[PDB]
Design a protein around this ligand. Structure first.
Ligand SMILES: CCN(CC)C(=O)N(C)c1ccc(C(=O)Nc2nnnn2C)c(C(F)(F)F)n1
Ligand SMILES: CCN(CC)C(=O)N(C)c1ccc(C(=O)Nc2nnnn2C)c(C(F)(F)F)n1
Ligand SMILES: [Co+2]
Ligand SMILES: [Co+2]
Lengths: 379, 379
C-alpha cells in the first residue's frame, strides 16, 4: 500500500557526500575500485580556500569527497565573504565528524522541486535544522536537516554544472572508467533504536513504509511516492548467539550513521568481474563467497529467471540472488570501505517489475536463512 | 670532507611512517600508484585496538601508514597493558597532527646498532625527547626524538618480522606489484630558518654537511658517516619575484615538516612508464614536463653518460638529469601526494661513484637555472 503521503515533491537521489581527512586519496581509491570517473572539483585551483571537494560519477551516481584545509587559509573571511562552494561546510564539524566516526557519509542528498519549501515543511514537521536554505548563484538552493547520528539529509533544487563554484576537471586528468554501476538504489542507516528513528524521519518527510515480504537485526524501509528514494534503517537485537553486526557498527562508529550504500549496475556480472580484478591492486575487497550448497540449492528458487549457465556465473563471483513477490534480486557486499568495520557497499541488479518500479525484489531479507541453512547443509 | 663525526652507529633508513585519517585508503592508493606491495599489518584482526597500521614495501623501501581507531575501543587499557604495536602512538597526538598538517610523514626511522644508547647520546647532545626507548618482545627497541616541526626521528635496533605485533598479510590479499623503486635515498624538511634547524640536528647526531657543488630557497644536507642516511633541510628566501614554494609549504602545512621523499629506482625509465600509466586511474600525477629547449640543450651536458636514444626517452617521460663532480643524476617530481600543496615524492636514479657511494651526483641544484634558462630560450 503506497498512500503517497510525501509532504513535498522529491525527485531522486542527487549525490552522496563523504567527509574524509584527505579527499584526494580516498577519491582516487574509490575511482579505481568502483570505475567512477573524475567529474568536477572545488579546491584551491578553483579559489576554494575552505575545503577540497572532488566529485566522482558513473551513470547517475555521484560520489562527493570533501576534506578541510587549514582554517588559517580562510581566517579573514566571514560567512557572506566565504570561498567555500558548499556553504554548509564548517571546519570544526568536519574535523569532529572524521575524528569521531572514521571515514563515512555526511550527507545523503535528494533533489527536490524547491529546497527551501522542503526545508520549511520539514522542520515544521519535526526535522532538526542542520543548515538553513542557501541560494547558490541564483541557480541552486541547498538546505540540510539532521537524519540520524551525524548524517544529514541534504535538499537540492535547481531553477534551471554540478554546483556553483565547481569547475570541470581537465580532460587529460579525466579517464573514462566504467564498470557498469549506474545509480544509487538505497542508503541504509544503523541506529540504537529504530522506532524513534522511523517516527522522526517518517514524521518530517511523509515517507511511507515499504513492503517487506536469530535475525541479528530489525529493519524497516522508508520510501518516497514513486518508491525511488529508499531509506532503510536497522537496529540491533541484543541477546543473540553471535553479537549483532549492527551493535558492532555502533561501537566502532561511535553511534548511529550510514551503514551501506547500494549501487545498482546495468550488468552485475561485468561490474563484479572488473571490481574483483582490482581487489588486490588498490580497489575493494568482497565478503567471502557462500558455500556451493547455496548455489546448488538455488536452481530450486530462481531457475525460472536464470539459466543454470549464469547461475554458475553467479558462483564464480560470489553473487547472491533472492526474490520477492514481483521480482528477483542479485546482490553482493564489499568489505568495509575503510579502517573501521563500519560503512560498506552493496552492488545490486534487480530484474522484474517492468519502466522499472522501485524496490523490485526487496532487499535480500530471505538470504539470512538461505545462507544459514546453506552453512548447516555443508557441515 | 667527511670527518665521520656520527655520535653513534647508524646503519640505514628503516621506514617512513605516515599519519593519516584512514590508513587503508591512503595505503591502497600508494600501493597502486607506486607499485609497492602489501607486506604486514597491525589492526583489529591482529588484536590492535589502538591503531591501524599497514606496511607497503618495495625493494628495501618501507612505507608505514597509520591511523587511530576510536579511543573507546581501548578505554580500559593502560600503557603497560596496551594493544598498540607502535608503543609511541597516541590518539590525541595523531588527531592533532593530521588535523594540523594534512597527510604527511610523522617519523623518519633509521636503523641503529642500539636504539637506547642512540636515544641517550642524542638527548645528551640536545635532542628533544619524543618517546623514550621501549623494548618490543625482547627483540626490537624503539625510541623517538624530535626532528623538526611535528616529525620525529625514530631509532630502531634489533638484537637479532617487521616489528613485534605485526602479522604478515594473506598471500591472496598480497599482489606482487613492482615498478622498480628500491630504497629511500633522502628525505627533505622545510623549516622557517635553516641555521637553528641544522645546528640542532647536526648537534645531536654528529651528522656532517654534504658537499653541494633568485634561488627560491637556501638548503643544506646532513649525512651519516658513509653518507647513506641523507637529511636535507630547506628554508625560504623572502623577497623574490615569485613567492617561495618553501614559504608556501609552511603556510599550508602549518609550520615545518617533511617536504619530499626521494625514492631511488633500479630503472627510472620503467618506473616512470608504469607510474605515468596510472596517473589518471588512481596513481600519482607528475609535475609538468620541461620544454624541449631543455632536452635540446642537454646533449651538451650529459651526452657522455647517455646515448641520445635515451635522452629522447628522457623527454617522453619528462625526466630531469643533472651532474655533479663525480656522477650524474636523473630525477622527476610527483605533484603533491594529497589535498594540500605540501609533501611530494621525487623519483631518482644515480649513475657513477662506483659499491655506489651516497649522494652520487648531488640533488639537482643545477636544474634551477638549467630550467630557467631553458624557459627563457623558448620565449
Ligand atoms: C555476508 C554477511 N551479510 C551481509 C553483511 C549477510 O549475511 N546478510 C544475510 C545480509 C543480506 C542483505 C543485507 C541488506 O542489504 N539489507 C538491506 N538493504 N537495504 N535495506 N536492508 C534491510 C544485509 C545488510 F547489509 F543490511 F547487513 N546483510
Ligand atoms: C618543477 C619545480 N621544481 C621542483 C618542485 C624545480 O623547479 N626544481 C628546480 C627543483 C630541483 C631539485 C629539487 C630537490 O630535490 N632538492 C633537494 N633534494 N634533496 N635535497 N635538496 C636540496 C627541488 C625541491 F624538490 F627541493 F624543491 N626542486
Ligand atoms: Co541493502
Ligand atoms: Co631531492
Amino acid at each position: 500500500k503506497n498512500p503517497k503521503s510525501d509532504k513535498f515533491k522529491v525527485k531522486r537521489f542527487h549525490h552522496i557526500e563523504f567527509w574524509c581527512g584527505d579527499a584526494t586519496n580516498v577519491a582516487r581509491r574509490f575511482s579505481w575500485g568502483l570505475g567512477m570517473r573524475f567529474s568536477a572539483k572545488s579546491d584551491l585551483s578553483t579559489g576554494n580556500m575552505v575545503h577540497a571537494s572532488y566529485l566522482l560519477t558513473s551513470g547517475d551516481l555521484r560520489f562527493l569527497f570533501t576534506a578541510p584545509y587549514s582554517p588559517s587559509l580562510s581566517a579573514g573571511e566571514i560567512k557572506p565573504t566565504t570561498t567555500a562552494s558548499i556553504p554548509s561546510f564548517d571546519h570544526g564539524s568536519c574535523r569532529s565528524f572524521f575524528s569521531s566516526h572514521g571515514l563515512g557519509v555526511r550527507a545523503v542528498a535528494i533533489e527536490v522541486e524547491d529546497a527551501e519549501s522542503a526545508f520549511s515543511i520539514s522542520v515544521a514537521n519535526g526535522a532538526i535544522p542542520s543548515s538553513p536554505p542557501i541560494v547558490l548563484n541564483e541557480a541552486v538552493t541547498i538546505a540540510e536537516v539532521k537524519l540520524y547520528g551525524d548524517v544529514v539529509l541534504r535538499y537540492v533544487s535547481y531553477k534551471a554544472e554540478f554546483l556553483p563554484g565547481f569547475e570541470r576537471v581537465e580532460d587529460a586528468s579525466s579517464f573514462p572508467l566504467d564498470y557498469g554501476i549506474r545509480r544509487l538504489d538505497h542508503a541504509v542507516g544503523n541506529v540504537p533504536e529504530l522506532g524513534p528513528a522511523l517516527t522522526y524521519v517518517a514524521g518530517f518527510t511523509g515517507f511511507h513504509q515499504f513492503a517487506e515480504f536469530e535475525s541479528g537485526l530489525n529493519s524497516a524501509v522508508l520510501a518516497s511516492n514513486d518508491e525511488m528514494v529508499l531509506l532503510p534503517i536497522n537496529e540491533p537485537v541484543h541477546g543473540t548467539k553471535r553479537k549483532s553486526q549492527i551493535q558492532t557498527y555502533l561501537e566502532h562508529n561511535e553511534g548511529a550513521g550510514l551503514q551501506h550504500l547500494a549501487l545498482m549496475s546495468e550488468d552485475i556480472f561485468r561490474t563484479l568481474r572488473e571490481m574483483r580484478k582490482r581487489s588486490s591492486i588498490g580497489g575493494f575487497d568482497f565478503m567471502p563467497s557462500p558455500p556451493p550448497t547455496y548455489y546448488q540449492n538455488l536452481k530450486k528458487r530462481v531457475g525460472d529467471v536464470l539459466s543454470d549457465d549464469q547461475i554458475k556465473e553467479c558462483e564464480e563471483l560470489g553473487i547472491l540472488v533472492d526474490r520477492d513477490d514481483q521480482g528477483t534480486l542479485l546482490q553482493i557486499f564489499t568489505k568495509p570501505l575503510g579502517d573501521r568495520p563500519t560503512i560498506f557497499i552493496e552492488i545490486i541488479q534487480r530484474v522484474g517489475c517492468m519502466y522499472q518500479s522501485g524496490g523490485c525484489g526487496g532487499f535480500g531479507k530471505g538470504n539470512f536463512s538461505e545462507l544459514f541453512k546453506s552453512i548447516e547443509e555443508y557441515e
